Structure formats: structure tokens, C-alpha cells
Design a binder for this molecule. Structure first.
Ligand code: MET
Ligand SMILES: [Co+2]
Ligand SMILES: [Co+2]
Ligand code: NA
Length: 263
């Protein structure tokens, strides 16, 4: 079943969502050539534990050994921070943060460009964020989740990119991954009509080349089969009476916090 959050639950998710967003705001200035992904992870964990008094939902989860996921270039998702993996000028990097506070999860990710913005990968990142924003603008009671995945795929493909099929957004709350699965492509047989108080993520993974992926020697890391660049952005939301509220909004987002579809 998909749980409907109570008003108190939603308030706790506002807090957890803000904390996850804060991690991404904090880490940004550290993302520069020469830093290791292991160091970035250490800085994130320190902040989550010691400044936010929260805990990483990733660390220990199905044995995952780090506190955030950091995915560079052709890595699609679930890249494992490593002390020896150094960022280079021109890299694109996803950092994906999930924190638990007061029993509730907040889950969000964004892309960072290492160095100047006008590089191979910039347009991929921008379009990936735009695909997330397109989807967020659709969320309201009475829409079928089917429609949202179809819209993401149509947009991404019209931009000359492909959508990763094997990974999806998810319900979230007291649990990390709850019902429903939020597909980012058109699947005629879905699904699920949205209702106020549902909380879930949208997190499209978009490849510059072909859609196919390969899962690596470590039980987590996913790369593009063609080693083309891949980008992802993620937000956690709550469905409101006439739209949604974006719980993991950051200072650099360019979409409104609260989206309303009423006249
Ligand atoms: C190591 S679990 C990482 C999960 C990821 N934060 C997600 O959005 O599902
Ligand atoms: Co995430
Ligand atoms: Co997620
Ligand atoms: Na990538």
C-alpha cells in the first residue's frame, strides 16, 4: 500500500527534506579539481551527524559502506565514494543524499560541473534537471503516475538523450523505498492515481548516448553500457490538495517551492 502522511508526518518530511537539501548546498564549494570522492563523502557525513544531528539513510543500508552516493561521468548511479578517485576539470558529478531525521527520510541529488560550465555534459545536466522540473509541474491529485513517466521519456528523447529504465523514483517516508515505483519512461500498464498526502521522489537518470546500462564489480555501481555521460537530479515531494510541495528545494533551484494548479 501507498501510505498517506498525516499533517504531522508531512511536517517531519519538510524538516528531513530541508536537511538533505542543505547537505547539497554545503558540499558545493568543495567540488573542485583534485578533491577525492572519499573526502566529499567524509564532509557530508560529518555535517549530517554533527551539525544536523541526523543520520545517513545510505550508510549500512543493504551493506552500503558510505554515507552518500557520488557518481562521475559515465557512472549512472550508486557510485561509491573512494579516497583515490579524484575529480578532474570537466567532470560532471552527481551527489545523492538521503538523511533520516525524527523517523522520516529526505532524498535528493544534483549534478555539479567541475570547472567552467561550457563543457561536454553541460547540456545533458541542464536537460536532465528540466526533465525533473517538467515532471514536478505535472504532480497533482487525480493524475496517473503513468503520464509522468511518459512525459519524461518524450522530453528526454526529443532532446536526443535516453532514459535509464532499470531504476525509478519511489515512495518515501518512514521507509527509504516505499510504494509506488515512479518510472521515468512510458509504461502503458502503470498504475497509480495521485492523492493528497502521498510522498515520493522523482529521480530521472538520463544518458547522452544509449539507454542500456551495466552493473559493476561492487554490487552498486551502474555505468552506461556505451560509457556515454549520464546525469541525474532528484527531489522528494508531497502531493498537496492542488499540486505539490518540493520538500528538498535548494537555493539554486529555479522551480517554485509550492506548485498550484487551481485557478
Ligand atoms: C545506497 S542507497 C541510495 C539510494 C538513492 N538515494 C535513491 O534515491 O534511491
Ligand atoms: Co537519492
Ligand atoms: Co530516491
Ligand atoms: Na554520471
Amino acid at each position: 500500500a501507498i501510505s498517506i502522511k498525516t499533517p504531522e508526518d508531512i511536517e517531519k518530511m519538510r524538516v528531513a527534506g530541508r536537511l538533505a537539501a542543505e547537505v547539497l548546498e554545503m558540499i558545493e564549494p568543495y567540488v573542485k579539481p583534485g578533491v577525492s570522492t572519499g573526502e566529499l563523502d567524509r564532509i557530508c557525513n560529518d555535517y549530517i551527524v554533527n551539525e544536523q544531528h541526523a543520520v545517513s539513510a545510505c550508510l549500512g543500508y543493504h551493506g552500503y559502506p558510505k554515507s552518500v552516493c557520488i557518481s562521475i561521468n559515465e557512472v549512472v548511479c550508486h557510485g561509491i565514494p573512494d579516497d583515490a578517485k579524484l575529480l578532474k576539470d570537466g567532470d560532471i558529478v552527481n551527489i545523492d543524499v538521503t538523511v533520516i531525521k525524527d523517523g522520516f527520510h529526505g532524498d535528493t541529488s544534483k549534478m555539479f560541473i567541475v570547472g567552467k560550465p561550457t563543457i561536454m555534459g553541460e547540456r545533458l545536466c541542464r536537460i536532465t534537471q528540466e526533465s525533473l522540473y517538467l515532471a514536478l509541474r505535472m504532480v497533482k491529485p487525480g493524475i496517473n503516475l503513468r503520464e509522468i513517466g511518459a512525459a519524461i521519456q518524450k522530453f528526454v528523447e526529443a532532446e536526443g538523450f535516453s532514459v535509464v529504465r532499470e531504476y525509478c523514483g519511489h515512495g518515501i517516508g518512514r521507509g527509504f523505498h516505499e510504494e509506488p515505483q515512479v518510472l521515468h519512461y512510458d509504461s502503458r500498464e502503470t498504475n497509480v492515481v495521485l492523492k493528497p498526502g502521498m510522498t515520493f521522489t522523482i529521480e530521472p537518470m538520463v544518458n547522452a548516448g544509449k539507454k542500456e546500462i551495466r552493473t559493476m564489480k561492487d554490487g552498486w555501481t551502474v555505468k552506461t553500457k556505451d560509457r556515454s555521460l549520464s546525469a541525474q537530479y532528484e527531489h522528494t515531494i508531497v502531493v498537496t490538495d492542488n499540486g505539490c510541495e518540493i520538500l528538498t528545494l535548494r537555493k539554486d533551484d529555479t522551480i517554485p517551492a509550492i506548485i498550484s494548479h487551481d485557478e
